[PDB]
Each structure stands twice: as structure tokens, then as C-alpha cells.
Amino acid sequence: RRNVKYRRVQNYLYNVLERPRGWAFIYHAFVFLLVFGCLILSVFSTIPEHTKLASSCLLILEFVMIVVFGLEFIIRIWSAGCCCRYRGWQGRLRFARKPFCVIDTIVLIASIAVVSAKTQGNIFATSALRSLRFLQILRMVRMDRRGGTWKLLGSVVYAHSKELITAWYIGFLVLIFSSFLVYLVEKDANKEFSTYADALWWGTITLTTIGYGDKTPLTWLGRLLSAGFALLGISFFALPAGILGSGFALKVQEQHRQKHFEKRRNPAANLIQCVWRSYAADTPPLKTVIRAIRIMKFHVAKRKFKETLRPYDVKDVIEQYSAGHLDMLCRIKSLQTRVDQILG
């Protein structure tokens, strides 16, 4: 009872920490905000006109950081042990074996080292201090499970590889050609367009629409060519962003549609029921063979539980109603045969 609730809440802590959902996301948003504030203060520490106050406030914020992350670290260890897979010393050690748990461990000891060096003032530590500060991004890095973001990006980039390559190829050709032409037109009148490398820098800055203004064509012919090629190249340089964004949005729409068409509920219940059957399994030989058949049912329902995980297709219902067609054919055949039997 008491211990029961003890482990129940321990499990809830595990959920909020290692299984973000709902307000646990609010909790992790808060810790991300703290990490981001630490990073901003670390950056401001670079400025000499603010280095004194930046570092002064950064010392206290780093103290708060170490306290909160140590508390989260120990609570995470305990709650993870809750799950009966990381229970006990051996299970806690296994949880620590996680790459992100060890990463948290190292960043935490590093942070303590930062604080101690600050207290001391060691020049060697002082020099290392900024690199140590950089480690805090590791918190956000950890917040991404199994590199989800990365994978997602890669997926889309691979899905649209042909068109991304098309955009890159055409844009690169436009960049090279326009840069060369503007170089030729302005190699003499304009000093900033002295070397073709400078023209390439101008072309890259222009076509991306950054337009610093450090190099700008002056001769009217140069400005005309720059205008035309700038139109073409800005379009082609903006392409990849547009292609990737449209890919992301269409992917979301597909995910939504698949979610709506999710029919896995009933086969998943079949999997659960056959699991219960296999449990009930565990005439001696008849019982043993019945257990074997129940295990086979368990595996079959798992396969069904997996083929449901495969999203929906219209081709599926095309085959479904196609089965309807064969059905009606056979049906009418039988009907006519038996009615002929009647006539006889």
C-alpha cells in the first residue's frame, strides 16, 4: 500500500523525466529555458564591457544549474529503477549504461569542475572554462531521443533527393555563370570585382539574398546582368528551403491520414487475447501441444499486430472490393446452378 504508492509516484517521476508528455514537456521546456539562459549569459561573458556582471550572474546561475541537474539526475536514476528493468543496483547500473545517462553524468561532473575552477581561479582551468561552458548544449542534444530530428531531416532529404539535387545543380550553374559574367563586365570599373573569387563571393551573397552591400555592381551593364541573374538565382537558391518545407508539411499530412486510418485496434486486441491464451497454456501431451498451438497463435497475432502498423492504402480497399467482386461472381454462379437444379 504505502510502498505501492511509493513506486507509483516513482513511476510518475520516471514518466515526466524520461517519457515527456503533456506537462512533462512543460517541465522540460523550463529546463531548456534554463540551459538557454546559461548559454546566453555565457555568450555575454565574452563581451568585455559586460564581462564583470555577466560572469557575476553566471556564477550564481551555474550554481543553480548544478543543483537542479544533480537533483534531476538522481531522481531520474531512482525513477528509472522503478520500471522493474532497471530495479536494484544492477538495474541502476544498466540505466547508467545508457549513452545519454553517462553523457549527463560527465556534463554534471564537468559543471562542478567549472564551479570549482571559478572558485579557485586557475589560469589553466580559466582557459578551459569556456569550452566547459559549451558542454551545456549537451542537455538539448540529449533531449533528442535516438537523434529523431536528424533522422527526420535525413528522411525528407532522401525522399526529395532528386529535386534537391536539381535545385542545387541549376543554382550552382547560375551562380558560376552569373558571377563570371559580372566579373567580366566589372573587372575594371569596379575594384571590389578585381578577382574572380571576389565575384564568386558577390554572387553567393546576392543569390542567397543576403546582400551585404560590400560588393555591388556599378557599371550599368553589370547591374542589368546582375538583376537578371539575381532573379533566376534567388529563385533557385530559395528552392531547397521550399522543397524541404513542403516535404515536411506533406509528411505531416500523410502521418495524420495514417493515424485516422489506424485499424490496428482490433488486431492488437487479438494479440492481447492470444497472449492471454498462451498464458492459460502455461492428457499431458494434449496440454503441451495446445500450448504449442497457443504460442503459434501468439506469433500470428503479433504478425497481424505488425501488418496493422503498416499504414492504410487505397490499393488495399481496391483489393478488398475486388474480393467483393469475386465473391459476387461465385455467388451468382452457385445461385444459377441451383436454380437450374430446381428447373430440372
The residues near 344 (Cβ < 8 Å, ≥ 6 apart) are none
The verdict on 260 binding ligand PIO (CB under 6 A) reads yes
Stretch that binds another protein, among 13-21, 186-194, 242-250, 321-329 (CB under 8 A): 13-21
The verdict on 278 binding another protein (CB under 8 A) reads yes
Among residues 6, 30, 134, 150, which is the contact residue for ligand PIO, using CB under 6 A? 150
For the chain, state the CA radius of gyration.
33
Q: Position 263: which residue type? A: K
Residue 5 marked ligand-binding: no
Stretch that binds another protein, among 60-68, 87-95, 142-150, 258-266 (CB under 8 A): 258-266
Partner touching 342 among a copy of itself, ligand PIO, another protein, none, CB below 5 to 8 Å by kind: a copy of itself
What is the DSSP secondary structure assignment for residue 344, as one 8-state letter? Answer: -
For the chain, the residue count is 344
Distance of CA 140 to the CA centre of its chain: 12
Helices (H) and strands (E) in the chain, counts: 14, 0
In the window 21-50, what residues touch a copy of itself (CB under 8 A)?
40, 43-44, 46-50
The residues near 330 (Cβ < 8 Å, ≥ 6 apart) are none
Query: Could you tell me which of 167, 18, 133 has the C-alpha nearest to residue 65?
Result: 133
In the window 156-215, what residues touch ligand PIO (CB under 6 A)?
157-158
Binding mask 81-120 for ligand PIO (x = CB under 6 A): ----------------------------------------
CA atoms within 13 A on the CB side of 131: 5
In whole angstroms, the minimum distance from the beta carbon of 329 to a copy of itself comes to 7
Angle between helices 220-260 and 148-159 (to 10 degrees): 110
Partner touching 121 among ligand PIO, a copy of itself, another protein, none, CB below 5 to 8 Å by kind: none
Q: Position 236: which residue type? A: F
Name the site residues for another protein (rule: CB under 8 A).
Answer: 8, 11-12, 15, 19, 21, 84, 264-282, 284-286, 288-289, 291-293, 295-303, 305
